[PDB]
Amino acid sequence: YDIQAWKKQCEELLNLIFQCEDSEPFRQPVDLLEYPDYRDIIDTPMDFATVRETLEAGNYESPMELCKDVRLIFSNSKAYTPSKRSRIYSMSLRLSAFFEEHISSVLSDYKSALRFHKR
Ligand SMILES: COc1ccc(NC(=O)N2CCN(C(=O)c3sccc3F)C[C@H]2C)cc1
């Protein structure tokens, strides 16, 4: 029932993600001058380095917030990708699956910890 355990769990999961080849397209922010169209499609840029930075700054209060930003990475790349005949989209789907399979217990454990605390 450790209310704070999620943070190290999320750090370790981001480490796994960064080690994963599938994360390559998503590790750093997009350059808007390099990707002309991104401006008009993505309303909120997000990448894994920003997520890790936010976590390490102490600017996430819950793993749910971290989860929302990670899911934004995946919806952003979906919005911009105009075809499945793309190494990027297939990479997003696989990395998303991996992320969700690992983040599920992190969320569960945090929410039970908060419930226990307010018991
Ligand atoms: C053949 O050479 C290529 C080299 C690279 C690329 N990459 C792309 O097309 N990407 C990168 C992933 N996309 C993203 O939305 C995000 S989300 C956080 C980071 C990020 F980059 C979509 C799009 C901008 C394409 C072709």
From Swiss-Prot:
It is found in: Nucleus. The modification Phosphoserine is found at residue 90. Expressed in myeloma and epidermoid carcinoma cell lines. It comes from the Eukaryota. Residues 1-106 form the Bromo domain. Interacts with IRS1 and IRS2. Interacts (via bromo domain) with acetylated lysine residues on histone H1.4, histone H3 and H4 (in vitro). It is linked to Chung-Jansen syndrome: An autosomal dominant disorder characterized by developmental delay, intellectual disability, autistic features, anxiety, hypotonia, obesity, and dysmorphic features. Probable regulator of the insulin and insulin-like growth factor signaling pathways. Stimulates cell proliferation through regulation of cyclin transcription and has an anti-apoptotic activity through AKT1 phosphorylation and activation. Plays a role in the regulation of cell morphology and cytoskeletal organization. This is PH-interacting protein. It comes from Homo sapiens (Human). The chain holds residues 1316 to 1434 of 1821 of the full protein.
